[PDB]
Amino acid sequence: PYGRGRTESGCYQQMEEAEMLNHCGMYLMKNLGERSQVSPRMREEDHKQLCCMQLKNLDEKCMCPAIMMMLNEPMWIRMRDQVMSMAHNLPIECNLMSQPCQM
Numbered sequence: 001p002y003g004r005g006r007t008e009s010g011c012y013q014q015m016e017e018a019e020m021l022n023h024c025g026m027y028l029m030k031n032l033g034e035r036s037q038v039s040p041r042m043r044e045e046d047h048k049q050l051c052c053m054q055l056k057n058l059d060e061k062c063m064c065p066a067i068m069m070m071l072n073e074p075m076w077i078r079m080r081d082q083v084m085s086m087a088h089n090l091p092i093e094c095n096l097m098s099q100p101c102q103m
Contacts, residue, residue, distance in 0.1 A: 005065045020058060021067060067091055
């Protein structure tokens, strides 16, 4: 499902500047803390192309090691515990972190 590859600050720093896994996070963070209570039909955006977008703006080497740091930003701590697995196949189905970093 993942790999092992540590390194100093890099892609992460380029991530905040190009918050790639920030919008795809809201979709996963929309049930992590949102008044499910809904009078009308429903309501909920979908940014799966805005993440798969900037994710490309990043390097193919930032599509695995960076993600880790993505869930370390000032918006991914405990609520990310869910966006962790959710954003584990989202970036893979895009070929971002499919299986780049291995053992």
